Design a protein around this motif. Structure first.
Motif, PDB file in Angstrom:
ATOM      1  N   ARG A 221      -6.099  12.939   9.697  1.00 29.12           N
ATOM      2  CA  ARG A 221      -7.278  13.021   8.856  1.00 29.12           C
ATOM      3  C   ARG A 221      -7.397  14.433   8.284  1.00 29.12           C
ATOM      4  O   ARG A 221      -7.728  14.602   7.116  1.00 29.12           O
ATOM      5  CB  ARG A 221      -8.479  12.585   9.699  1.00 29.12           C
TER       6      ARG A 221
ATOM      7  N   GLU B  44      -1.422   3.880   8.397  1.00 27.09           N
ATOM      8  CA  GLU B  44      -0.461   2.812   8.652  1.00 27.09           C
ATOM      9  C   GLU B  44       0.678   3.404   9.477  1.00 27.09           C
ATOM     10  O   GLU B  44       1.182   4.481   9.146  1.00 27.09           O
ATOM     11  CB  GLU B  44       0.079   2.292   7.318  1.00 27.09           C
TER      12      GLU B  44
ATOM     13  N   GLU C  56      -7.209   3.562   8.395  1.00 27.64           N
ATOM     14  CA  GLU C  56      -6.619   3.848   7.092  1.00 27.64           C
ATOM     15  C   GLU C  56      -5.237   4.476   7.255  1.00 27.64           C
ATOM     16  O   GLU C  56      -4.581   4.761   6.263  1.00 27.64           O
ATOM     17  CB  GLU C  56      -7.506   4.727   6.201  1.00 27.64           C
TER      18      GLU C  56
ATOM     19  N   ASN D 155      -1.661   9.370   5.532  1.00 29.55           N
ATOM     20  CA  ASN D 155      -1.976   7.949   5.513  1.00 29.55           C
ATOM     21  C   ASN D 155      -0.852   7.132   6.166  1.00 29.55           C
ATOM     22  O   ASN D 155      -0.937   5.912   6.267  1.00 29.55           O
ATOM     23  CB  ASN D 155      -2.283   7.465   4.092  1.00 29.55           C
TER      24      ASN D 155
ATOM     25  N   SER E  23       0.826  -1.195   0.000  1.00 28.66           N
ATOM     26  CA  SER E  23       0.000   0.000   0.000  1.00 28.66           C
ATOM     27  C   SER E  23       0.869   1.256   0.000  1.00 28.66           C
ATOM     28  O   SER E  23       0.396   2.288  -0.455  1.00 28.66           O
ATOM     29  CB  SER E  23      -1.003   0.035   1.181  1.00 28.66           C
TER      30      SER E  23
END
Lengths: 173, 159
Positions: B79, B114, B112, B84, A41
């Protein structure tokens, strides 16, 4: 500006990323699949690098390990599966990778991890080690533990992909 | 497509170790924010404005790095910033435990995002903000562990 410079890796923004994720994967578990899914990802490409000749004799041969993992990960487009028989730093260099993925499960392993990372820095300075924690769901599993539960007839369907679970039952009579 | 990572911390003040981590991170992610905690529960030696100013200068040479203060839930900031990835340097075994706990909580709060971990270079493996201040407080030489701008500011704070 290629006539002047080819470019360095540091101080100049983001660069193509290619990661290797080495292991014995004997066999690949859901915990392995999670780690590589997360890695894939965030980096351009990921090689699952499977060790041909681990010190402890594996339940599955290299061919088997590579086949099961290839199947289990085929839904990830930026992932490829390969066997290797070399230092992880040598393989990374041969593969022109700049990232090394390590799963970080336990405290017992932290020192060992840091120390391998120092060695790999020494061997291949351009290779960055990146450490992912396993999801809470897969925090207590390992190839070893799954095999031993399975051997004595415990249910491990929750921990393996279907292809691997079937191959494992075949191995165990 | 794009990757954008937050490196949060108290950075009181930023060290060569922090600088090494964020340089490495900025080489692997499109953008990196140095997120400086406004209100750490233990009052810092440098206020937020000072912490941000020192860190800005120290990291000016890295084009894809931005330095920001924050005072909200990390998940809310990430956010808000459309980040991310969360970066942590991982120096001690004691930190690993705590960081793994927060990472799990962060997964609950923001699936969402990582969390990613880097080990410090061997050179910086024993330094912390806290240590360097303690040494400098009793006139120990810490020129090796800080950028000039930070070193001078620390000297000023002790005099």
């Amino acid at each position: 500006m290629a006539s002047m410079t080819g470019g360095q890796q540091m101080g100049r923004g983001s660069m193509s990323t290619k990661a290797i994720y080495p292991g014995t994967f004997d066999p690949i578990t859901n915990g392995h699949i999670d780690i590589i899914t997360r890695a894939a990802s965030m980096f351009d490409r990921v090689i699952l690098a499977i060790a041909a000749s681990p010190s402890k004799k594996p339940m599955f041969d290299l061919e088997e390990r590579v086949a099961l993992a290839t199947t289990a990960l085929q839904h990830l487009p930026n992932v490829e599966v390969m066997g290797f028989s070399d230092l992880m730093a040598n393989f990374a260099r041969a593969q022109q990778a700049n990232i090394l993925i390590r799963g970080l499960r336990a405290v017992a392993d932290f020192e060992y991890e840091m120390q391998l990372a120092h060695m790999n820095r020494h061997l291949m300075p351009e290779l960055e080690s990146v450490f992912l924690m396993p999801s809470k769901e897969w925090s207590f599993i390992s190839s070893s533990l799954v095999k031993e539960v399975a051997r004595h007839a415990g249910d491990v369907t929750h921990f393996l992909p279907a292809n691997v679970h079937q191959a494992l039952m075949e191995k165990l009579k």
